[PDB]
Amino acid sequence: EEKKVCNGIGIGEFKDSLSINATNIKHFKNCTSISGDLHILPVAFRGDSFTHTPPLDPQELDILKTVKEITGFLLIQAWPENRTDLHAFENLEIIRGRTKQHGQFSLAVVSLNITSLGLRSLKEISDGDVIISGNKNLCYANTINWKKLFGTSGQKTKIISNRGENSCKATGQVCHALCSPEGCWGPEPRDCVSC
Amino acid sequence: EIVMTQSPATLSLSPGERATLSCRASQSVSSYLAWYQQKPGQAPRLLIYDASNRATGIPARFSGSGSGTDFTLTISSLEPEDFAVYYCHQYGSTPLTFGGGTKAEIKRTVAAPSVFIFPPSDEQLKSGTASVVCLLNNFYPREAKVQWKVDNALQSGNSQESVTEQDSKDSTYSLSSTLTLSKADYEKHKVYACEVTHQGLSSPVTKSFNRGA
Amino acid sequence: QVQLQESGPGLVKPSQTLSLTCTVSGGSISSGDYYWSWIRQPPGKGLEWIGYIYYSGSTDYNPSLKSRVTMSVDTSKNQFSLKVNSVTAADTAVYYCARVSIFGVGTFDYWGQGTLVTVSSASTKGPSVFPLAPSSGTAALGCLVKDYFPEPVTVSWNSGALTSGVHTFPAVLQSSGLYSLSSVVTVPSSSLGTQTYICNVNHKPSNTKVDKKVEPK
Ligand SMILES: *[C@@H]1O[C@H](CO)[C@@H](O[C@@H]2O[C@H](CO)[C@@H](O[C@@H]3O[C@H](CO)[C@@H](O)[C@H](O[C@H]4O[C@H](CO)[C@@H](O)[C@H](O)[C@@H]4O)[C@@H]3O)[C@H](O)[C@H]2NC(C)=O)[C@H](O)[C@H]1NC(C)=O
Ligand SMILES: *[C@@H]1O[C@H](CO)[C@@H](O[C@@H]2O[C@H](CO)[C@@H](O)[C@H](O)[C@H]2NC(C)=O)[C@H](O)[C@H]1NC(C)=O
Ligand SMILES: *[C@@H]1O[C@H](CO)[C@@H](O)[C@H](O)[C@H]1NC(C)=O
Ligand SMILES: *[C@@H]1O[C@H](CO)[C@@H](O)[C@H](O)[C@H]1NC(C)=O
Known about the structure:
Helices cover 6% and strands 17% of the residues of chain A. Chain A has helices at 42-46, 165-170, and strands at residues 5-7, 33-35, 38-40, 69-70, 74-76, 94-95, 105-110, 124-125, 129-133, 157-160. Chain B has helices at 122-127, 183-187, and strands spanning 4-5, 10-13, 19-25, 33-38, 45-49, 53-54, 62-67, 70-75, 85-90, 97-98, 102-106, 114-118, 129-139, 145-150, 153-154, 159-163, 173-182, 191-197, 205-210. In chain B, the strands form four sheets. In chain B, strands 2, 4, 5, 6, 9, 10 and 11 form a seven-stranded mixed beta sheet that branches. Chain B has a four-stranded antiparallel beta sheet with strand order 1-3-8-7, with no helix packed on it. Chain B is elongated and about 65 Å long. Helices cover 0% and strands 50% of the residues of chain C. Chain C has strands at 3-7, 11-12, 18-25, 34-41, 48-53, 59-61, 69-74, 79-84, 93-101, 108-111, 115-119, 128-132, 138-148, 154-157, 166-168, 172-173, 179-188, 198-203, 208-213. The chains are: A mainly beta, B mainly beta, C mainly beta. Chain B binds chain C through residues 1, 34, 36, 43-44, 46, 49-50, 53, 55, 87, 89, 91, 94-101, 114, 116, 118-121, 123-124, 127, 131, 133, 135, 137-138, 160, 162-164, 174, 176, 178, and chain C through 46-49, 60, 62-64, 96, 98, 105-109, 111-114, 128, 130-133, 138, 140, 142, 144, 146, 167, 169-172, 174, 180-182, 184, 186. Bound molecules: a molecule of 4 linked components (NAG-NAG-BMA-MAN), a molecule of 2 linked components (NAG-NAG) and 2-acetamido-2-deoxy-beta-D-glucopyranose (NAG) (2 copies). Chain A: It is found in: Cell membrane; Endoplasmic reticulum membrane; Golgi apparatus membrane; Nucleus membrane.
């Protein structure tokens, strides 16, 4: 505690680094703000011989729990298979989108094994589009109203090739009985937007 | 899975005409919908994506609209090169799916077929089987009925039919119908008839031969 | 520059495994921007989605294929592949590979040329050629090309020198597992005895090439 601003991937000391990884992860201990972007990629869990990077222990992703704000974009293209949601980012409150994936996207979630997103603290995405893509076991994403998180005219979300709404319904994977029409990030009470 | 339905399955038009194709989804897909064009022996080519947005290089007479469950591809004015199959495709939820396709067909002047019949040859008869072939040549439109008759008995389950695609120069179809029997069964009966119905003709036309005559 | 091409055997026996490779040029196959996919189309029929693979390892398959399919990547050749086990005639289809640009247009953009795979137990057999004799303006005659495996045959008339009013039908599968087809031509009556007619049948999987004169009986 309290305020501690850290550089993100592809600026300052990480300017040549492709992903968060086993070598650089420690340097995020106790950051509350990222000044730039977070990239989370397959080479992180695989490791890489050419840059002498060891594989990353998934338990250490939990060092990102303190992070409340990212001034750039968040991009997750790999995640541990036995995590049902993005637990690490449960305290993320703001993605600004001052800088964007391919100039377009400020949040991007691509082909994970998750069954829910889990971003219960997310209240604002200031600029940039959202893309949730190819997550074959993901429910819940169509329940929230994204337009209420947006801050710039022209923001939209592409939610494509994910699990079907019908199959979620048949296995009781909908918002909890006590949520409001505002939707949820998961099956539990503590996951609804408004109470 | 989400089912996609395209009807009519066939449209029949001439060049310069306006074209309106329909596509329906059994569950909602927002605007996550694409249209494809396909010609024989070729892969499909993307026309429109997101309902809505025309792809780079795609001619302006091609355009699309709709949301949720109801979609429409509109060709404001056909060019000879637009005759082909058009498929709709949802990518909103897994598994990804396509519709059955609508085929755009060359409207043409109505033409009754020339009917022809061929006996089996002696050379085939030595081997123990007998094919009788019937030809429907250079006709339009596609709809046709063929009925085989042997000494007046209506044949069932022993014929197979084959149809050409629209002729690249005259736009007609033609059709062959082959009837197969053993040597034994063929030598028991005298009169072999091929009966054709088509809207070009006021009454059905029958060609026949008499075995061995 | 971006280029896709399917390759592999055109023939697989019922109950065995079907295998194909797609090669890619104009960009490395290891990339966050693309799903690498497979789609199939039986002759005369609609499009069916098979699945995809991503550079991260993860995959997605159509449940209609009852866990019979796997895909894999081989960065060593910039290639991805398909296995389908326990095949039957229902697996006959032109097979396509295709790319998806996840951050661009977001649906299939570049496609392969497509490749035909037939599932069947038939052994290869050359065809017989039977004449279709004319008789009763315009006449008609032809050739019945019967009982061969596998496809295709190619037929021409008078060494490719007739060409006009000629019709060659698509082949049909018969109860016996063998294919049958006929080629036809329309001609003037008048000159039925003053002009001679021959059809040229070729079937290259078999080693047989046949010529048959067709005459009025
Ligand atoms: C995982 O995280 C670690 C820690 O962040 C990260 O290690 C870093 O790798 C980069 C790139 O390999 C290193 O930056 C380089 O430093 C070398 C000297 O080590 C310089 O020579 C490089 O210089 C410029 O050199 C070329 C010619 O002048 C330029 O054309 C080019 O742009 C080069 O940038 C370069 O700056 C950095 O030193 C390390 N950091 C540490 C502390 O080791 C690793 O890359 C990450 N791996 C993955 C796969 O995520
Ligand atoms: C990827 O996620 C899926 C879906 O959550 C996992 O499949 C589940 O596995 C658990 C094992 O504890 C079962 O109890 C669930 O019933 C399964 N869900 C169903 C019905 O598919 C899968 O285990 C995950 N994969 C890996 C490698 O961890
Ligand atoms: C994070 O907070 C704990 C508890 O306040 C502190 O002991 C620790 O040193 C901090 N992390 C840093 C900056 O290393
Ligand atoms: C999560 O999955 C990996 C499997 O490689 C394992 O190492 C880890 O302990 C698992 N956690 C669970 C399910 O307790």
